[PDB]
Amino acid sequence: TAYGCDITTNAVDGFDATIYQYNANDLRLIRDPTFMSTGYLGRNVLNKISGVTVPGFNIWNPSSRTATVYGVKNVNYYNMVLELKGYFKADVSGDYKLTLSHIDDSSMLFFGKETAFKCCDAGSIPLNEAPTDYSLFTIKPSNQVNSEVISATQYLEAGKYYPVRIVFVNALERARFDFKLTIPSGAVLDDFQNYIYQFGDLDENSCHE
Ligand X SMILES: CC(=O)N[C@@H]1[C@@H](O)[C@H](O[C@@H]2O[C@H](CO)[C@@H](O)[C@H](O)[C@H]2NC(C)=O)[C@@H](CO)O[C@H]1O
Provide the binding-site residues for Ca ion, judged by CB under 5 A.
104-105, 170, 173-174
- Nearest approach, Cβ of residue 48 and ligand X (Å): 24
Note whether 83 binds ligand X by CB under 6 A: no
Q: Which stretch binds ligand X (CB under 6 A): 16-24, 109-117, 170-178, 185-193?
A: 170-178
**Main-chain dihedrals φ then ψ at residue 155, nearest 5 degrees:** -80, 125
Q: Give the 3-state secondary structure of residue 150.
A: strand
Task: From the list Ca ion, ligand X, none, pick the one residue 143 interacts with, judged by a Cβ distance below 5 to 8 Å according to partner type.
Answer: ligand X
Q: Determine whether 58 is exposed, middle or buried from the number of CB atoms within 10 Å of its CB (0-12, 13-18, 19+).
A: exposed
Of 98, 132, 99, the residue nearest 113 (C-alpha): 132
180: β partners = 99
Radius of gyration of the chain, Cα coordinates, nearest whole angstrom: 18
Residue placing its CB nearer to ligand X in the complex, 83 or 105: 105
Task: From the list Ca ion, ligand X, none, pick the one residue 44 interacts with, judged by a Cβ distance below 5 to 8 Å according to partner type.
Answer: none
Q: Is the peptide bond before 105 cis (omega within 30 degrees of 0)?
A: yes
Residue placing its CB nearer to Ca ion in the complex, 59 or 156: 59
Q: Determine which residue in the list 8, 43, 56, 60 makes contact with ligand X, applying CB under 6 A.
A: 60
> What CA–CA distance (Å, rounded) separates 200 from 113?
20
Give the binding-site size for ligand X (rule: CB under 6 A): 10
Note whether 104 binds ligand X by CB under 6 A: yes
Q: Characterize the bridge pairing of strands 196-199 and 80-89.
A: antiparallel
Note whether 82 binds ligand X by CB under 6 A: no
Q: Determine which residue in the list 36, 105, 111, 161 makes contact with ligand X, applying CB under 6 A.
A: 105
Residue placing its CB nearer to Ca ion in the complex, 27 or 189: 27
Residue 200, amino acid: G
Note whether 142 binds ligand X by CB under 6 A: yes
Q: Which stretch binds ligand X (CB under 6 A): 2-10, 106-114, 169-177, 191-199?
A: 169-177
Contact 10, 17 (CB under 8 A): no
164: β partners = 86, 111
Give the interface with ligand X as residue ranges (CB under 6 A). Answer: 60, 104-105, 140, 142-143, 171-174
